[PDB]
Amino acid sequence: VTCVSQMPVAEGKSLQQTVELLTKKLEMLGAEKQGTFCVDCETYHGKLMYVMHYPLSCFALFENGPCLIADTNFDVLMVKLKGFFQSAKASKIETRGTRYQYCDFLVKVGTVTMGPSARGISVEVEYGDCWSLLLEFLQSFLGSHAPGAPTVFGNAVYGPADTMIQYMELFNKI
Amino acid sequence: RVVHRDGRVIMLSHQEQELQDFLLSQMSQHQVHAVQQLAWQVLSFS
Amino acid sequence: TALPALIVPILEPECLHIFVDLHSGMFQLMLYGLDPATLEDMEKSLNDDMKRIIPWIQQLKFWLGQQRCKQSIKHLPTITTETLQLANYSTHPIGSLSKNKLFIKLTRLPQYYIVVEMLEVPNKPTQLSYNYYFMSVS
Amino acid sequence: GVNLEAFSQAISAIQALRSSVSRVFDCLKDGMRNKETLEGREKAFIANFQDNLHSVNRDLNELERLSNLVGKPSENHPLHNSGLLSLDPYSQLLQAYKWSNKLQYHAGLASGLLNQQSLKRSANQMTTLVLPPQYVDDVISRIDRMFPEMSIHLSRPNGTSAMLLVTLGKVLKVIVVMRSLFIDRTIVKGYNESVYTEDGKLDIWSKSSYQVFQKVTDHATTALLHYQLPQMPDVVVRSFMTWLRSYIKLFQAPCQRCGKFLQDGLPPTWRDFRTLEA
């Protein structure tokens, strides 16, 4: 279902220009503006915050997606433990970007936050496995990439909103 | 929306459905095919 | 015109009805068909300027011509598109904003079929004479 | 298992093992009648010799053979022989054992050739095609549930007509609301988009999906409108179930690449492939 994101393998020019070329290729494929989203990140010495689609925020050091409430429910907990668990170091980079839809799918590319950051892309699926066919789409998008590495052998099944943990892997690339 | 055999969905208006006549012609042809299969059966070049 | 509001044709045969908001400005309109959330821009333009009508007229002409084409060709096995998506040898085809249809029953994609009506008919807001051209690229 | 039938082919194999060598010596029974074109005739001899290699292949044929042996040797067949002389005048039954099989096998051809029917008419020769008893529905439900790994359920909250839902490996459940006997007017969705257990308040219709299964729903409607045989509604619903079973994988993509559209499926020919091409 929720396919994992991928690092921006394409790196031959300006990151902004690279994202622009990727979006131009996507438009050449043929899509429509489905809005713009973001992916936040806040580390606390290591609970890593997150936000995606979208009326719900998430934060987890190592858990199977314990988030089912809005940021307010979580931000209040953080503010309450201002000296107990508040270990907010230098603000972790957070990406953003528009999202388009070729056909019956969704695409989303990321952006840099401080400037020397990545601009990776993320895609998902609509089935419940089936990692083979979804790769073909990316074959039409770029060259060899997207190793995936999902939580295989679980279907704790279908990885519902657990892909944010995979998003943490993208945060590891720094 | 309508599907005869192959998911041929088309949109239309209040009083424009003359495709029915085309369906009648195709049904006539298919009936010729069927009766040929009944009684020497020619190929399926219809 | 009519009793509730006015009426304007787009072709020379039904479509493109426009009425007025009896409680405010920005008189609405609705052409039976497709392309939603796009006519709203036309609505805004008429509400603001009320002068620029003929560009939307030509646009609606193109749109409904292509719509009629597709609605009549959608009985045989085919598929529609908006461009050939490959201008390899930009020498054979030439023209303007056009349409294109393809087919499966003969083969996957041996030869597409790009077609365009002869827009801007002489002294005729309609009847673009529907020019036809065949191509044999692969 | 049923691999024993393979040994039958092996029989024919060793048959050639005889014929081959005969075909050898027969070829040596006479010389060149009139070549006049080439000396491949002698090579022709070696040609027959080549077929002798087939014999070695027979020995290879045993590699795939010998899967496993079944318990209780003799398979309860000669138990009748253990009877006294009184039982021996009984082989007749065994003969019928084959005969009955032949019967079925005969029908296996006959019914097959019955496919080409000759019913020039089907009316003006008589009734109540709609099944009166509200128990044959449960019978068909049980027959369908006899199929493994494919669960079927039904509640029928609307009334006399039949209403049912089916689930598969994925969450692409199918809701079929049809008349008393034959299946018609069904729909499909995926991932709780229908949730026809207690949708809103009950097994709702909602006539919707996110533009992925709609084509599959239309194709299933077409299949229902096409498989409506004049009689034997059980056969009709069984064919419908078999057709539905063909989507349990959604993995392959022949006669095209897996990028033509959202998905690909139209198997009325007992085999799925790239859609929008038939």
Curated annotation (Swiss-Prot), chain A:
It is found in: Nucleus. Coiled coil: none annotated. GO terms for biological process: positive regulation of transcription elongation by RNA polymerase II; positive regulation of transcription initiation by RNA polymerase II; RNA polymerase II preinitiation complex assembly; skeletal muscle cell differentiation. GO terms for cellular component: core mediator complex; mediator complex; nucleoplasm; nucleus. Transmembrane segments: none annotated. The keyword Cytoplasm does not apply. Signal peptide: none annotated. Keywords: Activator, Nucleus, Transcription, Transcription regulation. GO terms for molecular function: transcription coregulator activity. It holds the Pfam family Med20. Component of the Mediator complex, which is composed of MED1, MED4, MED6, MED7, MED8, MED9, MED10, MED11, MED12, MED13, MED13L, MED14, MED15, MED16, MED17, MED18, MED19, MED20, MED21, MED22, MED23, MED24, MED25, MED26, MED27, MED29, MED30, MED31, CCNC, CDK8 and CDC2L6/CDK11. The MED12, MED13, CCNC and CDK8 subunits form a distinct module termed the CDK8 module. Mediator containing the CDK8 module is less active than Mediator lacking this module in supporting transcriptional activation. Belongs to the Mediator complex subunit 20 family. This is Mediator of RNA polymerase II transcription subunit 20. It comes from Mus musculus. The lineage of its organism: Eukaryota, Metazoa, Chordata, Craniata, Vertebrata.
UniProtKB/Swiss-Prot annotation, chain B:
Component of the Mediator complex, a coactivator involved in the regulated transcription of nearly all RNA polymerase II-dependent genes. Mediator functions as a bridge to convey information from gene-specific regulatory proteins to the basal RNA polymerase II transcription machinery. Mediator is recruited to promoters by direct interactions with regulatory proteins and serves as a scaffold for the assembly of a functional preinitiation complex with RNA polymerase II and the general transcription factors. This is Mediator of RNA polymerase II transcription subunit 17. Component of the Mediator complex, which is composed of MED1, MED4, MED6, MED7, MED8, MED9, MED10, MED11, MED12, MED13, MED13L, MED14, MED15, MED16, MED17, MED18, MED19, MED20, MED21, MED22, MED23, MED24, MED25, MED26, MED27, MED29, MED30, MED31, CCNC, CDK8 and CDC2L6/CDK11. The MED12, MED13, CCNC and CDK8 subunits form a distinct module termed the CDK8 module. Mediator containing the CDK8 module is less active than Mediator lacking this module in supporting transcriptional activation. It comes from Mus musculus. Belongs to the Mediator complex subunit 17 family. It comes from the Eukaryota. The chain holds residues 501 to 550 of 649 of the full protein. It is found in: Nucleus.
UniProtKB/Swiss-Prot annotation, chain C:
It comes from the Eukaryota. It is found in: Nucleus. Component of the Mediator complex, which is composed of MED1, MED4, MED6, MED7, MED8, MED9, MED10, MED11, MED12, MED13, MED13L, MED14, MED15, MED16, MED17, MED18, MED19, MED20, MED21, MED22, MED23, MED24, MED25, MED26, MED27, MED29, MED30, MED31, CCNC, CDK8 and CDC2L6/CDK11. The MED12, MED13, CCNC and CDK8 subunits form a distinct module termed the CDK8 module. Mediator containing the CDK8 module is less active than Mediator lacking this module in supporting transcriptional activation. Component of the Mediator complex, a coactivator involved in the regulated transcription of nearly all RNA polymerase II-dependent genes. Mediator functions as a bridge to convey information from gene-specific regulatory proteins to the basal RNA polymerase II transcription machinery. Mediator is recruited to promoters by direct interactions with regulatory proteins and serves as a scaffold for the assembly of a functional preinitiation complex with RNA polymerase II and the general transcription factors. Belongs to the Mediator complex subunit 14 family. This is Mediator of RNA polymerase II transcription subunit 14.
Swiss-Prot record, chain D:
Belongs to the Mediator complex subunit 27 family. The keyword Kinase does not apply. It comes from the Eukaryota. Keywords: Activator, Methylation, Nucleus, Phosphoprotein, Transcription, Transcription regulation. Pfam families: Med27 (PF11571). This is Mediator of RNA polymerase II transcription subunit 27. It is found in: Nucleus. The modification Phosphoserine is found at S118. InterPro entries: Mediator_Med27. One of its GO terms (cellular component) is cytosol. Component of the Mediator complex, a coactivator involved in the regulated transcription of nearly all RNA polymerase II-dependent genes. Mediator functions as a bridge to convey information from gene-specific regulatory proteins to the basal RNA polymerase II transcription machinery. Mediator is recruited to promoters by direct interactions with regulatory proteins and serves as a scaffold for the assembly of a functional preinitiation complex with RNA polymerase II and the general transcription factors. The keyword Transmembrane helix does not apply. It comes from Mus musculus (Mouse). Its main location: nucleus. One of its GO terms (biological process) is RNA polymerase II preinitiation complex assembly. GO terms for molecular function: transcription coactivator activity; ubiquitin protein ligase activity. The modification N6-methyllysine is found at K120.
